[PDB]
């Protein structure tokens, strides 16, 4: 096993070695302290093996800085980037860092860990809608991992992290864990998501991406923090803090949403979970002080397509009926329930809303097209805890009244929140980046 060391004056030789395919398992490409400007088109390829990846890393964590024009493609097996700081770099074209070489030649078992992407905005792209688009990280292939990274201050349109699916490469089992997705200011239009899993056109395909133990801090570009657009993904134990958007099951089916926590601080645009499409299981989520919606269950325009469906007549970009969704053991604290809104004639069917706590000061419960929507819900053994003890009796729908029991405000909620936040923030991100430590300390001291 060999270490190959380079300095900023050696960018040409560095790019050649990384892109040659000649690196062997256990080898490392090591960058001495400095700023590496304008790498431009750079490939990282090779074949590591399990337990012996090929590594591209800083000699001293955080002191190798990559800036300027960049088009990095990663493809091969068991390749790892570690401890790199991407600062004021930007994409030559659409994609700054991509896990594919030529179309069809993918990364697998590759990993980006303890890296930062901060302020990586093309000066020649604009900050307003339609003034330019660039994506920071594109996942392709299978079994790749993004972990313990910090991504913040994207100011141009486009995704922080896109999971790309195709008809012949969709089932990925990628893992996105222990990352800190920091501030994103309002974009003023669509296309400023943090994570997008698939696309409308790939949304009927199984992805099996796992998004676990991540922090989203002031992610406020648009109404979707995470836009789930594919099937069988798992979103677990994430923290959404002061973020002006929601976790949205936008397209695709059978997504599993477990034990996430939302701390909105009553800020503009903060939201919880938005449900479109079928088959999801939504368990143990805790949604607090969000102002747009706590839970939204939408009508659909079309049924889920079959092989016979002409998707030119029933587009995948539309909205598909909610059916067969289990919503159990969640908490909605000073956060609304909005059931049956949206355009379309496909009412929700077979939605179970059971064992949830709906609590706060004044309840915010919105039911649309009640006599057509409520038959599609089973409300069972929920708890209702609000200041006015007459409030449940004032609800117009007996089926709703019978599905809730009034209770006094439970006394363990502050401790429950502390456990959830403590579990998410003290193992997140790269420890060497001061802004990660500062932002984590902010959450810790402003719960
Ligand atoms: Ca969007």
Author numbering: 21 to 467
What did the original publication write about this model?
Here, we show that BcelPL6 of PL6 subfamily 1 from the human commensal gut bacterium Bacteroides cellulosilyticus CRE21 is a monomeric, single-domain polyM-specific enzyme. Alginate lyases break the O–C4 bond to uronic acid residues through a β-elimination reaction that leads to formation of the 4,5-unsaturated sugar 4-deoxy-l-erythro-hex-4-enopyranosyluronic acid (denoted as Δ) at the nonreducing end of the released product. PL6 displays a right-handed parallel β-helix fold similar to several other polysaccharide lyase families. In summary, recombinant BcelPL6 from B. cellulosilyticus is M-specific and produces mainly disaccharides as end products from alginate and di- and trisaccharides from polyM.
BcelPL6 crystallized from 0.2 m calcium acetate, 0.1 m Tris-HCl, pH 7.0, 20% PEG 3000 in the space group P21, and the structure was solved at 1.3 Å resolution with two molecules in the asymmetric unit. Both PISA analysis and SEC indicated that BcelPL6 is a monomer in solution. The 10-“step” asparagine ladder in BcelPL6 is the longest reported to date and spans almost the entire length of the β-helix (10 of 12 turns). The visor cap is kept in place by a hydrogen bond from Gly-423 to an asparagine ladder that creates an extensive hydrogen bond network on the hydrophobic side of T2 loops leading to their distinct shape. Electron density indicated Ca2+ and two acetate molecules near the putative catalytic lysine and arginine residues in BcelPL6. The carboxylic acid group of DP4M at subsite −1 aligns with acetate shown in the native BcelPL6 structure and interacts with His-219 at subsite −1, whereas C5 carboxyl groups at subsites +2 and −2 interacted with the 98% conserved Arg-294 and Arg-216, respectively. BcelPL6 has a rather flat and open active site; in AlyGC the C-terminal dimerization domain partly covers the active site forming a cleft, and in AlyF, loops form a closed active site over the nonreducing end of the bound DP4G. The 95% conserved His-271 situated between subsites +1 and −1 appears critical for activity as BcelPL6 H271N was inactive, although it retained the Tm of BcelPL6 WT.
